[PDB]
Design a protein around this ligand. Structure first.
Ligand code: MG
Ligand code: MG
Ligand code: MG
Ligand code: MG
Ligand code: MG
Ligand code: MG
Ligand code: MG
Ligand code: MG
Ligand code: MG
Ligand code: MG
Ligand code: MG
Ligand code: MG
Ligand code: MG
Ligand code: MG
Ligand code: MG
Ligand code: MG
Ligand code: MG
Ligand code: MG
Ligand code: MG
Ligand code: MG
Ligand code: MG
Ligand code: MG
Ligand code: MG
Ligand code: MG
Ligand code: MG
Ligand code: MG
Ligand code: MG
Ligand code: MG
Ligand code: MG
Ligand code: MG
Ligand code: MG
Ligand code: MG
Ligand code: MG
Ligand code: MG
Ligand code: MG
Ligand code: MG
Ligand code: MG
Ligand code: MG
Ligand code: MG
Ligand code: MG
Ligand code: MG
Ligand code: MG
Ligand code: MG
Ligand code: MG
Ligand code: MG
Ligand code: MG
Ligand code: MG
Ligand code: MG
Ligand code: MG
Ligand code: MG
Ligand code: MG
Ligand code: MG
Ligand code: MG
Ligand code: MG
Ligand code: MG
Ligand code: MG
Ligand code: MG
Ligand code: MG
Ligand code: MG
Ligand code: MG
Ligand code: MG
Lengths: 98, 48, 177, 136, 48
RNA sequence: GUGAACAGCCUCUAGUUGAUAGAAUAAUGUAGAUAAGGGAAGUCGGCAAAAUAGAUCCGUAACUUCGGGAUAAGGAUUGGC
RNA sequence: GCAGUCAAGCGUUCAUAGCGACAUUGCUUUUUGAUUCUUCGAUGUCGGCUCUUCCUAUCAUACCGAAGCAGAAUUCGGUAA
RNA sequence: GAAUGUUACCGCAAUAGUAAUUGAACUUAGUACGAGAGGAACAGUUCAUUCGGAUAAUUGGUUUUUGCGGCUGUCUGAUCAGGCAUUGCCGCGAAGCUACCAUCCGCUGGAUUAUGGCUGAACGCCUCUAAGUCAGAAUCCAUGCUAGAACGCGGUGAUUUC
RNA sequence: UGUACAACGGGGUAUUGUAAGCAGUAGAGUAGCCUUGUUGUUACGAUCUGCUGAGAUUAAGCCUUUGUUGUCUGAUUUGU
């Protein structure tokens, strides 16, 4: 079971729900309701219809703490040396000086 | 009560939809326990 | 689906299989780069954090960082981009590409252990494989030993042994710059 | 359906009653197909027989090569438009009605099929599958 | 209870649901739960 | 006022607000509308209905009594500021 | 219009698998005639549309018997509306 | 719907009605049969046609939800907000209604017809028939399904004091 | 006289598509006064943006409710 999403509005389309349009050039559109589906046929542009995901994305509506930072990074520092040279005499010659 | 939709795999060897999901309508009837308050006993007669 | 897991600290890798829709499910709708805790996927991995780095679906088509989408699309690729090696200067090809968002269609998820769980994963944390090559350019030899331009590299250059039946040869790089 | 169709077809909404004209989808020379009958269809006083996706009709060519005109021949519906509903739950419709001219066996007169093809037809008619680009 | 012991295959199949729809029947339901609806929509001028 | 306009539609002056009434909204009607896909297969017959339409620009066949046919056909455009 | 009886013939052979001349016995009342009994102080024509029901001399569908039924196809017949 | 003491609840079942239809594909099987060309069927499986009874989760249609928005013309000094244009017009539109345009459901026993048989005399033989009997059809009777006799009926509750 | 009932109100569920108000270095631009501009200043401008997936409507045969206010003996008739 896959939840699809609305080509025009970007709403979740739970199973058997709204309608599916296969356009002239084998591009497949999915509407969750005759609303999105009329607006689509009307040649309306999703990015100008305010309630659409697409519109809100474009107009940066209510995203807030997705621009908030995080705490994601590693902590490594481990030697393996060089394959073929005996990784024994690679730490006792690894004593630096400054 | 009402109706809703179901999604389930189908077990039907031979069918084009064997082992595939189908969506199906269903009804739901509210069914609290029934309470037993009487017994009634019938006898057979040549009149029913 | 296969998980292809790397422990870049050790240089190790081993694959793991999973036949559990619910365990598998955890990776769904996540993207490349997003981190994933362990206990869900398996009790082996309790603790372990995985960074999702890519992977293939059936039909074998690779994922591609950046696309978003949980489907497959055909893109026009160039030089210096993943999933395409140009045959000819100025060549660009149109090519199918799998999206970056994980879904049940993937044959293999490519994970990369970012930090270690409460327990060891056999062929991974318990085995370690050394870098093939050593520093070749003069100052890289300096920094890989912290040396200051005084110590003279010539003897700090790494040396790899090799036997000729009853002769053992020793060959170093060739410093440069 | 029928002769030359290996497999069955789960019922799909009829969209093309007799008199429907559908786009001809192959490269046989024919530009359109006028439906005069539907195969294996039954009978009720006053009902038009009607085709659905993957049905074999009997048609004539209203527009196209003169060698293709003025005769009845078999053809197969490959795109519908009237929305119909698969067992997986979806109501889906194409953007045009269209079929490809064929022989009783179900073999295609032409060799390519322009545009998409519905699966339920693909599944039903091997040589229609062959000459398909995008199915569904 | 049925009056006969059907064998039908259709009868006998042992179904096992995968998903029960639970969005609003009072219109074009877009959401199973108020939780899901919160997820998708974000904070509203009411809310916290 | 709009508009080509003594058109339609709204308005001032003047004049009416008269036409049994109340409560419901079954069937069948009369009068007014709409319908997915197909598109005259309906019918004696496209009956009924639908479609078209203003203005500016472009473009306009047969044939002809040379006056026409002609808004032939076919197209684009049209608000606000 | 439909169905019989006799059986000379047809059917390579073979009357009657399937048919069937000359004759001849019938049934039917959606043919057409023949009649003129009812209605001329009126019982609204032809066809179509719609809708019910009925008959069987059965086209299909169920189960059968026969064949000049190898099979497949078909033909003849029965119980059947 | 009067009257059969009243009123209420639960039931019986006389009689009447009654319903399911047809096809294909797979498999059997390139099998049986056949020199060959060709070429079946029963059991099993998946679908379909015609019909019927419902239903409205989904999709579609309907729109006076005159619910939200848009538009023209005018009128209320402007604004806000509105009135009028026999529902002014347009896009969307819940709810209800609704469509093989949508979904779901349509039972299994007996007795028989034709016909093929058993045993078996008439007629020492022979015969499915005379006695007796087996098997048997989209038929028939029931099962099931709809009414429920307003002059068919049962079980049960409570039955008025100014 | 109570898990009562209703009318409101609240919350949910829906529908539409971002209200009025205010503000703005957004705006083809335009006026007016000078102290004639080293954003000169004061206001006007279809539309745009922000507060604002807002505002409106939402049982009339949607769901729910610890809130508010209210209501809770009129009439007729029946017996073996
Ligand atoms: Mg619609
Ligand atoms: Mg709708
Ligand atoms: Mg060098
Ligand atoms: Mg073409
Ligand atoms: Mg007719
Ligand atoms: Mg022509
Ligand atoms: Mg080919
Ligand atoms: Mg609803
Ligand atoms: Mg007067
Ligand atoms: Mg009058
Ligand atoms: Mg009245
Ligand atoms: Mg229509
Ligand atoms: Mg047309
Ligand atoms: Mg005609
Ligand atoms: Mg025509
Ligand atoms: Mg006709
Ligand atoms: Mg005529
Ligand atoms: Mg005629
Ligand atoms: Mg007319
Ligand atoms: Mg129209
Ligand atoms: Mg002309
Ligand atoms: Mg302009
Ligand atoms: Mg003779
Ligand atoms: Mg003979
Ligand atoms: Mg002879
Ligand atoms: Mg006759
Ligand atoms: Mg007379
Ligand atoms: Mg007479
Ligand atoms: Mg007369
Ligand atoms: Mg008379
Ligand atoms: Mg008269
Ligand atoms: Mg009369
Ligand atoms: Mg008979
Ligand atoms: Mg028989
Ligand atoms: Mg013979
Ligand atoms: Mg009958
Ligand atoms: Mg009879
Ligand atoms: Mg009868
Ligand atoms: Mg009395
Ligand atoms: Mg085979
Ligand atoms: Mg032979
Ligand atoms: Mg029938
Ligand atoms: Mg309005
Ligand atoms: Mg203002
Ligand atoms: Mg008027
Ligand atoms: Mg509706
Ligand atoms: Mg039906
Ligand atoms: Mg039944
Ligand atoms: Mg039964
Ligand atoms: Mg019986
Ligand atoms: Mg015997
Ligand atoms: Mg017998
Ligand atoms: Mg007898
Ligand atoms: Mg006898
Ligand atoms: Mg039967
Ligand atoms: Mg009674
Ligand atoms: Mg009684
Ligand atoms: Mg009150
Ligand atoms: Mg806003
Ligand atoms: Mg009502
Ligand atoms: Mg309150």
């Amino acid at each position: 079971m896959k939840v699809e999403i609305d080509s025009f509005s970007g709403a979740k389309i739970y199973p058997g729900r709204g309608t599916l349009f296969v356009r002239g050039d084998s591009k497949i559109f999915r509407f969750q309701n005759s609303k999105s589906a009329s607006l689509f046929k009307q040649r309306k542009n999703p990015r100008r219809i305010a309630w659409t995901v697409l519109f809100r994305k474009h107009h940066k509506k209510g995203i807030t703490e997705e621009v908030a930072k995080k705490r994601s990074r590693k902590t490594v520092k481990a030697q393996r040396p060089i394959t073929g040279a005996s990784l024994d005499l690679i730490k006792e010659r690894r004593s630096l000086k400054p | 009560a009402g109706m809703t939709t179901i999604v389930r795999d189908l077990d039907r060897p031979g069918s084009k939809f064997h082992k595939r999901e189908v969506v199906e309508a269903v009804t739901v009837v509210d069914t609290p326990p029934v309470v037993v308050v009487g017994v009634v006993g019938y006898v057979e007669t040549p009149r029913g | 689906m296969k998980l292809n897991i790397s422990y870049p600290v050790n240089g190790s890798q081993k694959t793991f299989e999973i036949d559990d829709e619910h365990r598998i499910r955890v990776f769904f709708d996540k993207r490349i780069g997003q981190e994933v805790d362990g206990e869900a996927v398996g009790d082996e991995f309790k603790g372990y954090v995985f960074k999702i780095s890519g992977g293939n679906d059936k039909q074998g088509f690779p994922m591609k960082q950046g696309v978003l989408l949980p489907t497959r699309i055909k893109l026009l690729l160039t030089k210096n981009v993943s999933c395409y090696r140009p045959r000819r200067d100025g060549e660009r090809k149109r090519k199918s590409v799998r999206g970056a968002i994980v879904g049940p269609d993937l044959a293999v998820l490519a994970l990369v252990i970012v930090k270690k769980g409460e327990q060891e994963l056999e062929g991974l944390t318990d085995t370690t494989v050394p870098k093939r090559l050593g520093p070749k350019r003069a100052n890289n030899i300096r920094k890989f030993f912290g040396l200051s331009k005084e110590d003279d590299v010539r003897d700090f250059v790494i040396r790899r042994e090799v036997t000729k039946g009853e002769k053992t040869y020793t060959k170093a790089p060739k410093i440069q710059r | 359906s029928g002769n030359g169709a290996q497999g069955t077809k789960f019922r799909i909404s009829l969209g093309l009653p007799v008199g429907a004209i559908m786009n001809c989808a192959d490269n046989s020379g024919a530009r359109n197909l006028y439906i005069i009958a539907v195969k294996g269809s039954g009978s009720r006083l006053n009902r038009l027989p009607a085709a659905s996706l993957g049905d074999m009709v009997m048609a004539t060519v209203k527009k196209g090569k003169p060698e293709l005109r003025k005769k009845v021949m078999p053809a197969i519906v490959v795109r519908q438009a009237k929305s119909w509903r698969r067992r997986d739950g979806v109501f889906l419709y194409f953007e045009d009605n269209a079929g490809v001219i064929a022989n009783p066996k179900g073999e295609m007169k032409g060799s390519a099929i322009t545009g998409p093809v519905g699966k339920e037809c693909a599944d039903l008619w091997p040589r229609v599958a062959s000459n398909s680009g995008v199915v569904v | 209870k049925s009056l006969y012991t059907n064998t039908s295959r259709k009868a006998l199949e042992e179904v096992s649901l995968k998903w029960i729809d639970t969005a609003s029947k009072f219109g074009k339901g877009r959401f199973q739960t108020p939780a899901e609806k919160h997820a998708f929509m974000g904070t509203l001028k009411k809310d916290l």
